Write a protein that binds this ligand. Sequence first.
Ligand SMILES: *[C@@H]1O[C@H](CO)[C@@H](O[C@@H]2O[C@H](CO)[C@@H](O[C@@H]3O[C@H](CO)[C@@H](O)[C@H](O)[C@@H]3O)[C@H](O)[C@H]2NC(C)=O)[C@H](O)[C@H]1NC(C)=O
Ligand SMILES: *[C@@H]1O[C@H](CO)[C@@H](O[C@@H]2O[C@H](CO)[C@@H](O)[C@H](O)[C@H]2NC(C)=O)[C@H](O)[C@H]1NC(C)=O
Ligand SMILES: *[C@@H]1O[C@H](CO)[C@@H](O[C@@H]2O[C@H](CO)[C@@H](O)[C@H](O)[C@H]2NC(C)=O)[C@H](O)[C@H]1NC(C)=O
Ligand SMILES: *[C@@H]1O[C@H](CO)[C@@H](O)[C@H](O)[C@H]1NC(C)=O
Ligand SMILES: *[C@@H]1O[C@H](CO)[C@@H](O)[C@H](O)[C@H]1NC(C)=O
Ligand SMILES: *[C@@H]1O[C@H](CO)[C@@H](O)[C@H](O)[C@H]1NC(C)=O
Ligand SMILES: OC[C@@H](O)[C@H](O)[C@@H](O)CO
Ligand SMILES: OC[C@@H](O)[C@H](O)[C@@H](O)CO
Length: 720
Amino acid sequence: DEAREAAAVRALVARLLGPGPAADFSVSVERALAAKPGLDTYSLGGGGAARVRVRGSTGVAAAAGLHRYLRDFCGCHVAWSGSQLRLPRPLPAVPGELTEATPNRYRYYQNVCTQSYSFVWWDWARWEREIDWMALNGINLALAWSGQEAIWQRVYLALGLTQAEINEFFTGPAFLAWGRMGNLHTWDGPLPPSWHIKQLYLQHRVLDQMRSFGMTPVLPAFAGHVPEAVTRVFPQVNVTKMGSWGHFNCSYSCSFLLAPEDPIFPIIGSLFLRELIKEFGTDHIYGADTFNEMQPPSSEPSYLAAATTAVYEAMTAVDTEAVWLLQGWLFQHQPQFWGPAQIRAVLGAVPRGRLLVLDLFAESQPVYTRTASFQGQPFIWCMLHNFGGNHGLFGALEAVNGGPEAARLFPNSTMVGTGMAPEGISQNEVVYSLMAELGWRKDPVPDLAAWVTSFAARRYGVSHPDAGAAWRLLLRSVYNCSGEACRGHNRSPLVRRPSLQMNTSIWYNRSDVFEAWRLLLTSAPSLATSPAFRYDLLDLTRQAVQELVSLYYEEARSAYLSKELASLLRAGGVLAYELLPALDEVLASDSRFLLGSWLEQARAAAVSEAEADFYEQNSRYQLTLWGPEGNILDYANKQLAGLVANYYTPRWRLFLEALVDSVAQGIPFQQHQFDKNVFQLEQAFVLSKQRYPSQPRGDTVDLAKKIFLKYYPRWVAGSW
Ligand SMILES: *[C@@H]1O[C@H](CO)[C@@H](O[C@@H]2O[C@H](CO)[C@@H](O[C@@H]3O[C@H](CO)[C@@H](O)[C@H](O)[C@@H]3O)[C@H](O)[C@H]2NC(C)=O)[C@H](O)[C@H]1NC(C)=O
Ligand SMILES: *[C@@H]1O[C@H](CO)[C@@H](O[C@@H]2O[C@H](CO)[C@@H](O)[C@H](O)[C@H]2NC(C)=O)[C@H](O)[C@H]1NC(C)=O
Ligand SMILES: *[C@@H]1O[C@H](CO)[C@@H](O[C@@H]2O[C@H](CO)[C@@H](O)[C@H](O)[C@H]2NC(C)=O)[C@H](O)[C@H]1NC(C)=O
Ligand SMILES: *[C@@H]1O[C@H](CO)[C@@H](O)[C@H](O)[C@H]1NC(C)=O
Ligand SMILES: *[C@@H]1O[C@H](CO)[C@@H](O)[C@H](O)[C@H]1NC(C)=O
Ligand SMILES: *[C@@H]1O[C@H](CO)[C@@H](O)[C@H](O)[C@H]1NC(C)=O
Ligand SMILES: OC[C@@H](O)[C@H](O)[C@@H](O)CO
Ligand SMILES: OC[C@@H](O)[C@H](O)[C@@H](O)CO
């Protein structure tokens, strides 16, 4: 109720600022503050000689008001990487009563993938910080995906499956996103008993905390995928075996899909939802997806309607208030299958307003556009932005700034909210800061250059003219990809398998990055004490090294092709023996860029050495080979200390060496042979029991300065 929501926001203020400064805020929650039912509203008053009055129509609204006040009146900044929470004394006064309402019924957060790429090894402490970030960003709808395998285990045991069948079925922890969608099964499991104990524990705390703010946590439901062992206990079920996803064979993919009209369908679907709800309660919104990246066995509208009605009916068969949150990714991913009549069949099969669809990649491939606003079903306009959790400076900020407005103005628009659905978090914080803001604004931000200048100013605690100019440069270059082919996948040579056919082209002027780097480095004598400045300088230096690797690749390749041995040794030499080690070393100077920081999260999730080794191996697979044969090679690449020294660099050394051997003998370089040798090194990184440091070493500013002094003059002079 109102009181519990206000107490939740009061406790947020105390975690955020300390209990001392928290006493200067008067928080309340009052339903009547909203003019229109379900359009969240906050108001700010007071300050100066008086306490700061923050009122919300809900707990999330109040938290958004708090953020509004801290950002625009106090100059504060909150992000995944850290915060800048200096309060002026006295606290600034607000003129009269400032009251703002969102035009969005929902602000949504999380991809299904984010659960595996970023949240896998999170404990409660980390989730608690994330739910605060969510509340401050005004989020009222989000996935609560933890612990669902523990519920499926109860269901399957009750259906007569053996514990061994259940253990064989789930993937390892790092691959559960794809197990849950039916893309995968089995790969790199089993889930150990401690996993379920910890995830059930976690999920209860997540749900309690979300609900205390008045957030709506979305819960999973059955979408038709079942383990093969279901055909042992129910041997007359009608099932179709799906195709291979992600180049996995039938030991790991080729999922069994239960036919929509099989009598077992509502029985399994109902038993799962009932067990889920007994354990966790419900807020009446359920997520399910049958055909994410998997071609349905028929394009007949009548079949596709029945497959969709079967899932919705299983939900309403236990909860008559059910609303089904559906990912729209498939419509964009297999456009040749998903013609107008196929899409109309799914969208028409659930009553209007009971399908809430995520237009998941709306900043670049919106579907509302080509389906007359999902044939009248409500939708949430999502920015996807990031794939694989990849590091790399990227954004299409003009398209995100104008996107929600265009969706709202579209004829017969059924837009009911905005969302952020990155595959991984902990990158490109500027992009999420903007899209979160668009959650509450009526209009696009009018001047992006001034906005990014203020973003940097609040983040560093000072408006520096060089740092400001650096960010304006990044805004118009890396953060302004335009066109239909803008994807935030890092495909740079640094993170990919070396070859003679790598494409080094980009969507911006490379000089803008090197200038931005120079300008940000010039700011260091003022800003070096800001953890956020250190983070951004490191991220930008890292980007500059990524650019240099590409440029040195170009030189090495041209020299290979001309049989210029000395030039090839020189160019390939600085790439593999100087640039890459320099990168690893500078990354190693901050805890937020250590492979070892993430792997120690994995060890702390385990309860034994053996289990910890298993989780760490899971993590190393996920970042590199993905599957056992390099099935989705480098898709979840990252630029972390340890990973660059022991994975990216050995591949480049081997590649250079094979090129110089080729030029030195008579002999052409053969890709297929190098492909076999480099696979041994990639796999060795995965299977090694090497431990990686979780403590930083060296000074970030000093190391970045050395890289700049050495490589920047070579850039301006063209002399490699
Ligand atoms: C589906 O894919 C998996 C993973 O690639 C296959 O399992 C793998 O099978 C291979 C070949 O049998 C094993 O590799 C090695 O083969 C040599 C044979 O000369 C042997 O000396 C080594 O000890 C080793 O066994 C590999 O261990 C195994 N990998 C895993 C992760 O289990 C599987 O066979 C494929 N399934 C189908 C149905 O095709
Ligand atoms: C927006 O919605 C309305 C649905 O009411 C569509 O207009 C109806 O359909 C045709 C026009 O193409 C007319 O014969 C009906 O009489 C219209 N109804 C009304 C009340 O005007 C309209 O076409 C939709 N726009 C788009 C782009 O699909
Ligand atoms: C993002 O890119 C687009 C394309 O370069 C920019 O939009 C142009 O802005 C100029 C003014 O400088 C206008 O005269 C043009 O009409 C626009 N061009 C096109 C092709 O649309 C935009 O300024 C860039 N955004 C940022 C924030 O730097
Ligand atoms: C299985 O279900 C599909 C419809 O989903 C149907 O085409 C097929 O005839 C059914 N097969 C059997 C053996 O019942
Ligand atoms: C790299 O890709 C771009 C389009 O994305 C294309 O125009 C270009 O020709 C490609 N370069 C090479 C060398 O193949
Ligand atoms: C990129 O920046 C450099 C240096 O300011 C400039 O010489 C060049 O003409 C710029 N633009 C393009 C499209 O190359
Ligand atoms: O406006 C204040 C609210 O806290 C949020 O919606 C921000 O605008 C974006 O973080
Ligand atoms: O590539 C496998 C990834 O984990 C997913 O994000 C999707 O398959 C991308 O389309």
